[PDB]
Design a protein around this ligand. Structure first.
Ligand SMILES: *[C@@H]1O[C@H](CO)[C@@H](O[C@@H]2O[C@H](CO)[C@@H](O)[C@H](O)[C@H]2NC(C)=O)[C@H](O)[C@H]1NC(C)=O
Length: 534
């Protein structure tokens, strides 16, 4: 059986998985139960010497997405979404869920000093677990190309458990509990990965969707000071769909609103100390109360009930202002998107069919946007179906007269155009950006949000050369071109720089393009980012 040593020298036993070695379910924090609910994680101090870690531990409590894909999608599109496992609750789950897992090449010794790819799963900040989105394919490919890496994944609290907000949470300084979980795991890696054969100074953090936004957050965490024990917690970052979270502070309007609902539904409305009452709830009651707020696939959609919010200390301010003001770590980065990020989410408002309904929907989703700003917005994103997402599909995929429009808007604000704003202001290091169109032609969704997960962890596709090969090269040499791809990946400086600045993917292979599309939408959304925060 494979073995490894921890920071204090304790020895643990792993699992020989034939194609790789795994150390699963390692506790990195005291169970965030009872009194510790909503609070940052406390490091685990009990000795693990002589123990075995051959199985995943449970995921953190999961919030039902409240969506319905197998009711609106045709077979081929549905099959791919299911294969990606995106937005699917992970079982079993429990509040005692803060474990970390390590996957390494077989025969890896403590002296290997391999680069470490620290993965942050994405599940809309309301569900998900480290057990899904397997790193096996990444590791196998790193070995095949002679640039072996160690894959690390951690669970972090989601929904109310990890992102409860409101005035009480803020006054206590407990905003963004789930992000703290991720932060502690990163510190855990700094202190323990060497004993598994990894090099703590070669950590590349990466994530998809909520995990990509989390990765970005880690760049601006504590205003860009990512040092721990005197050393950077990571040397690079990869963002697969998402960066800045367009959100108001912890004690803002919607955070307080969602909090009041949880408190009321849990039977704590008459408590003199609301937080203490919530902390004294059975696991089931807190779960039920949480189930009484909207899930990610429900009508409010990307107006998430739970998501990272500026707290003033760890995420000190409006995340868009953080990047403009340079409060970030200086590391090279890769950040890309799937051509049609918003299709999955647009499926949550198929009852919005008229221009008037669309306007009403945007107004309720963006409580800070004036009528004038909404006008400009609806002029940038028209009802002309040929201009919506799936992009460049003409009259096709218009399941409703507004689906392609709403999809385009939501995908751009949450992912694609937000990325351009990040790239335009970020000067922390060399930047590389990609835009996938690998699934062009796929009815209804197109190259949808999360499809990269399939080609990164389950199947080999044209995009795999990027999600695997290029990413591994980046984690190894801080340059995706060391992957030896037959198409050079140009560096990105600004959305108006000369020539092609995006590595792109089609059904067969690679090519490059320009990040110059939908400019009026970019200006309509970001002339004042806060007007479109949730
Ligand atoms: C589309 O359907 C959603 C889901 O039912 C509607 O949202 C609900 O509307 C009712 C009545 O207006 C509210 O009491 C609920 O709180 C809403 N639920 C959610 C998920 O927020 C929405 O109004 C419909 N939109 C249109 C254009 O008809």
């Amino acid at each position: 059986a494979p073995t490894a040593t921890l920071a204090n020298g304790d020895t643990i036993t792993g699992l020989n998985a034939i194609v790789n070695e795994k150390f699963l379910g390692i506790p990195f924090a005291e169970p965030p139960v009872g009194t510790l609910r909503f609070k940052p994680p406390v490091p685990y101090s009990a000795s693990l010497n002589g123990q075995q870690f051959t199985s995943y531990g449970p995921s953190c409590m999961q919030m039902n997405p409240m969506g319905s894909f197998e009711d609106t999608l045709p077979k081929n599109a549905l099959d791919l979404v299911l294969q990606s496992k995106i937005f699917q609750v992970v079982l079993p789950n429990d509040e005692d869920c803060l474990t970390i897992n390590v996957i390494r090449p077989p025969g890896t010794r403590a002296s290997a000093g391999l680069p470490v790819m620290l993965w942050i799963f994405g599940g809309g900040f309301e569900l998900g677990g480290s057990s899904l989105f397997p790193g096996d394919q990444m590791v196998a490919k790193s070995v095949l190309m002679g640039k072996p890496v160690i894959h690390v994944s951690m669970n972090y609290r989601v929904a109310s458990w990890g992102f409860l907000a409101g005035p009480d949470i803020q006054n206590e300084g407990s905003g963004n509990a789930g992000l703290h979980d991720q932060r502690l795991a990163m510190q855990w890696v700094a202190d323990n990965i060497a004993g598994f054969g990894g090099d703590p100074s070669k950590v590349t953090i990466y994530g998809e969707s909520a995990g990509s936004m989390s990765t970005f957050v880690h760049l601006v965490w504590n205003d860009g000071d990512n040092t721990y024990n005197g050393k950077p917690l990571f040397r690079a970052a990869i963002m697969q769909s998402g960066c800045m979270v367009p959100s108001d502070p912890v004690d803002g309007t919607y955070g307080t609103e969602i909090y009041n609902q949880v408190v009321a539904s849990a039977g704590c409305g008459s408590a003199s100390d609301k937080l203490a009452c919530l902390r004294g709830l059975s696991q089931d009651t807190l779960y039920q109360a949480t189930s009484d707020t909207p899930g990610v696939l429900a009508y409010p959609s990307l107006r998430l009930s739970y998501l990272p919010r500026p707290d003033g200390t760890f995420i000190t301010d409006d995340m868009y202002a953080l990047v403009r003001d340079g409060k970030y770590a200086h590391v090279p980065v890769i950040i890309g998107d799937q051509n049609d990020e918003g299709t999955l989410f647009g499926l949550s408002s198929l009852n919005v069919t008229t221009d008037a309904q669309a306007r009403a929907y945007f107004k309720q989703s963006f409580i800070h946007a004036s009528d004038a700003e909404i006008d400009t917005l609806m002029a940038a994103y028209t009802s002309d179906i040929t201009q919506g997402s799936p992009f460049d599909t003409g009259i096709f995929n218009a399941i409703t007269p507004q689906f392609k429009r709403i999809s385009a808007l939501l995908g751009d604000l949450a992912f694609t155009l937000a990325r351009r704003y990040f790239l335009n202001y970020y000067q922390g290091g060399t930047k590389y950006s990609f835009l996938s169109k690998q699934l062009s032609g796929l009815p209804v969704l197109g190259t949808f949000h999360g499809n990269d997960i399939i080609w990164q962890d389950y199947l080999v596709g044209s995009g795999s050369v990027i999600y695997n090969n290029a990413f591994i090269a980046f984690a190894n040499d801080l340059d995706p071109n060391k992957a030896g791809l037959w198409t050079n990946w140009p560096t990105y400086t600004s959305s108006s720089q000369s020539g092609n600045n995006l590595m792109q993917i089609n059904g067969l292979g690679l090519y490059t393009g320009k990040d110059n599309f939908r400019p009026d939408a970019y200006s309509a959304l970001f002339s004042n980012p806060p007007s479109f925060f949730v």
